[PDB]
Enzyme design. Structure first.
Site, short mmCIF file in Angstrom:
data_model
loop_
_atom_site.label_atom_id
_atom_site.label_comp_id
_atom_site.label_asym_id
_atom_site.label_seq_id
_atom_site.Cartn_x
_atom_site.Cartn_y
_atom_site.Cartn_z
N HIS B 41 0.84 -1.22 0.00
CA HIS B 41 0.00 0.00 0.00
C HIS B 41 0.87 1.26 0.00
O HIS B 41 0.33 2.32 -0.17
CB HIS B 41 -1.11 -0.01 1.06
CG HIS B 41 -0.71 0.09 2.50
ND1 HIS B 41 -0.01 1.14 3.03
CD2 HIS B 41 -1.02 -0.70 3.54
CE1 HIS B 41 0.14 0.95 4.33
NE2 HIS B 41 -0.47 -0.14 4.65
N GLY B 143 2.37 5.79 10.37
CA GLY B 143 3.75 5.56 10.05
C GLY B 143 4.34 4.28 10.58
O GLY B 143 5.51 3.98 10.29
N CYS B 145 3.42 1.23 9.81
CA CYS B 145 3.34 0.12 8.88
C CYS B 145 4.73 -0.34 8.48
O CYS B 145 5.67 0.45 8.39
CB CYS B 145 2.56 0.53 7.64
SG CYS B 145 0.83 0.66 8.02
C1 LIG Z 1 0.54 2.41 8.12
O1 LIG Z 1 1.57 3.15 8.75
C2 LIG Z 1 -0.81 2.68 8.75
C3 LIG Z 1 -0.88 2.21 10.20
C4 LIG Z 1 -2.16 2.62 10.93
C5 LIG Z 1 -2.34 4.12 11.13
C6 LIG Z 1 -3.13 4.26 12.40
N1 LIG Z 1 -2.73 3.06 13.12
C7 LIG Z 1 -2.24 2.11 12.35
O2 LIG Z 1 -1.98 0.96 12.71
N2 LIG Z 1 -1.85 2.02 7.96
C8 LIG Z 1 -2.89 2.69 7.44
O3 LIG Z 1 -3.06 3.89 7.65
C9 LIG Z 1 -3.86 1.91 6.57
C10 LIG Z 1 -3.67 2.31 5.10
C11 LIG Z 1 -5.08 2.23 4.55
C12 LIG Z 1 -5.89 2.84 5.67
N3 LIG Z 1 -5.23 2.29 6.86
C13 LIG Z 1 -5.74 2.13 8.08
O4 LIG Z 1 -5.08 1.58 8.98
C14 LIG Z 1 -7.13 2.68 8.35
N4 LIG Z 1 -8.04 1.55 8.40
C15 LIG Z 1 -9.07 1.44 7.54
O5 LIG Z 1 -9.29 2.18 6.62
O6 LIG Z 1 -9.76 0.36 7.87
C16 LIG Z 1 -10.97 -0.08 7.14
C17 LIG Z 1 -12.03 0.98 7.34
C18 LIG Z 1 -10.62 -0.25 5.68
C19 LIG Z 1 -11.39 -1.40 7.74
C20 LIG Z 1 -7.19 3.49 9.66
C21 LIG Z 1 -6.16 4.58 9.65
O7 LIG Z 1 -8.49 4.09 9.78
C22 LIG Z 1 -9.19 4.01 11.05
C23 LIG Z 1 -10.41 4.89 10.89
C24 LIG Z 1 -8.30 4.51 12.18
C25 LIG Z 1 -9.59 2.57 11.28
#
Ligand SMILES: *[C@H](O)[C@H](C[C@@H]1CCNC1=O)NC(=O)[C@@H]1CCCN1C(=O)[C@@H](NC(=O)OC(C)(C)C)[C@@H](C)OC(C)(C)C
Ligand SMILES: *[C@H](O)[C@H](C[C@@H]1CCNC1=O)NC(=O)[C@@H]1CCCN1C(=O)[C@@H](NC(=O)OC(C)(C)C)[C@@H](C)OC(C)(C)C
Ligand SMILES: [Cl-]
Ligand SMILES: [Cl-]
Ligand code: NA
Ligand code: NA
Ligand code: NA
EC number: 3.4.19.12
Lengths: 306, 301
Positions: B41, B143, B145
């Site tokens: 991603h 950050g 990830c």
């Molecule tokens: C990578 O560094 C990062 C790690 C995240 C940020 C906050 N805490 C973490 O563990 N990953 C992301 O930001 C990924 C990339 C796509 C969006 N994402 C999320 O973790 C979303 N999750 C999300 O969209 O989940 C679904 C709705 C698709 C199930 C997070 C940032 O969003 C919420 C609203 C915090 C869950």
């Protein structure tokens, strides 16, 4: 989000751990520059421990009585001396992995990471607090002595603890790296006991702030209190006094969450007086006291080490 | 004596952490030999994430679109490939600090250490378990990830988790190092609820054995249970079934303490029925399920 009991990355310390053998005793040493530090009780037989005269026992030893091994490599001891309850073995080789470091003495309530080691080999890492009664609630077996506790700031390792003994209640006692015990404990085989402990109030408040930051809010209420009134409740429940400096240190968390310290104290007062009513806070049914205010800020803001 | 949430020493993994930037996104990568592994991603914009075609997005990238930094040194990307949900960036310099390592996909209930990192630098290390619903209860911010989970039994690093996402319930999801997600999750911004989680029964039993080893007996009783009656009861509390494999793995702890596995099950049944009545076990007022039998033997012996 999330909140875990988190230790410092241990790599800078792993490269300093060696094995030290004197007679039939093996334990760990800390190799920094050209010196290995370890507990002075390494020189004692069981009979010596009953009433050790450490300066006389040490004059009787020679450099060759100390076998130091860094992994599979032997380090030649070229000198030895005692500093309080720590033995300093001068070796012929400076540790090329010596990190930037300092020796610090911590205060009760402060947390640190322990690198538990056996036979000079790092085995595990966990987070502890120096209790108000100057013990630590560690996890240590035979051979763990010389394992160290530390904190990191930026790129500097602050060593604060070296492990020496277990007490009858299963908690642990040790020294700073200048060989001064934490607490009224001595390195001899005589009756000793942990004193009655108390709860680290400022740390509980810090963890309640961590809970709020992580969305756990059910214990918040409309009430506030005064420092004087809350400290009467703290004393009643065997909590440490909360000082104005503690209040000041929690200022950042208060501003961020909108919950003044004395507002949070009214929450803590009600939790002490009424319990949790079957609920949990950050996955605990007890009031956690081994996160400092700085630990909360560090974990919740993603501080890293260089 | 004592019993703590104990992680593995993190140094061997710290030596592998790098920063990876593509476009405006920065996350961590794992540098082993001449390959940097990271979540695919990294190549997505916010718009790409609803229904990204990763093959189409990746073919458009040049090697120079990936900025990889190891401390103060930029590593030169010379090729790239995608394996499931992980991107493998081939770099021109092999990591001189690469430890002995392997990749292992773990089962629910297994534990591991997490080295949480930001911008290629470590923040801290903690213990996690793969939950029965294939999430982990992590501590991860923007950050994080590309941070990894691992075990280091016998001087070999077994990498088992790479971090990709946080779910609405506040728990975390990611992949093995072959890029296959644990659980039903996908690296797309579409709804994907985790199942209802359950308690890892075999681990609770292991922790009760640890408590006995450390000198506590207050929760023992004079009763036993059949395996099937135990499971019928435990499931009413949203505990996972206990299988004969679990009974077998608890054998060594049973032998060491003199408490038959099914007798310990009777203790757990009574704890679920009664609570602790103001007492604690190993400093907890709840039944702890993130220590495995192997973890208890590692720490108590
Ligand atoms: C990578 O560094 C990062 C790690 C995240 C940020 C906050 N805490 C973490 O563990 N990953 C992301 O930001 C990924 C990339 C796509 C969006 N994402 C999320 O973790 C979303 N999750 C999300 O969209 O989940 C679904 C709705 C698709 C199930 C997070 C940032 O969003 C919420 C609203 C915090 C869950
Ligand atoms: C050094 O590796 C070792 C670490 C100990 C072993 C068990 N867990 C540990 O943390 N230190 C020792 O063995 C020291 C040397 C002197 C005795 N000792 C102990 O820890 C004793 N403590 C002891 O005798 O306490 C007094 C009675 C003197 C107060 C332990 C091993 O004994 C008890 C009975 C387990 C507490
Ligand atoms: Cl608890
Ligand atoms: Cl597994
Ligand atoms: Na209040
Ligand atoms: Na797209
Ligand atoms: Na795999």
């Amino acid at each position: 989000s999330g909140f875990r009991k988190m230790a410092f990355p241990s790599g800078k310390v792993e490269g300093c751990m060696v094995q030290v053998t004197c007679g039939t005793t093996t334990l760990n040493g800390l190799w920094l520059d050209d010196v290995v530090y370890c507990p002075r009780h390494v020189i004692c037989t069981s009979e010596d421990m009953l009433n050790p005269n450490y300066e006389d026992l040490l004059i009787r030893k020679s450099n060759h009585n100390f076998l130091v091994q860094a992994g599979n490599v032997q380090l030649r001891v070229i000198g030895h001396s005692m500093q309080n309850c720590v033995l300093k073995l001068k070796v012929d080789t400076a540790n090329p992995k010596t990190p930037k470091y300092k020796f610090v003495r911590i205060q009760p309530g402060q947390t640190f990471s322990v690198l538990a080691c056996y036979n000079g080999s790092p085995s595990g890492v966990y987070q502890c607090a120096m209790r108000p009664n100057f013990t630590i609630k560690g996890s240590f077996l035979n051979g763990s002595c010389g394992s160290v506790g530390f904190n990191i700031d930026y790129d500097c390792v602050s060593f604060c603890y070296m492990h020496h003994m277990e007490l009858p209640t299963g908690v642990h006692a040790g020294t700073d790296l200048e060989g001064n015990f934490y607490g009224p404990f001595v390195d001899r085989q005589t009756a000793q006991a942990a004193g009655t402990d108390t709860t680290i109030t400022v740390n509980v408040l810090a963890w309640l702030y961590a809970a709020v930051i992580n969305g756990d809010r059910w214990f918040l209420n409309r009430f506030t209190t005064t420092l004087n009134d809350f400290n009467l409740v703290a004393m009643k429940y065997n909590y440490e006094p909360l000082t104005q400096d503690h209040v000041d240190i929690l200022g950042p968390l208060s501003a961020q969450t909108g919950i003044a310290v004395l507002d949070m104290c009214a929450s803590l007062k009600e939790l002490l007086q009424n319990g949790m009513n079957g609920r949990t806070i950050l996955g605990s049914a007890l009031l956690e006291d081994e996160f400092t205010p700085f630990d909360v800020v560090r974990q919740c803001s993603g501080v890293t080490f260089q």
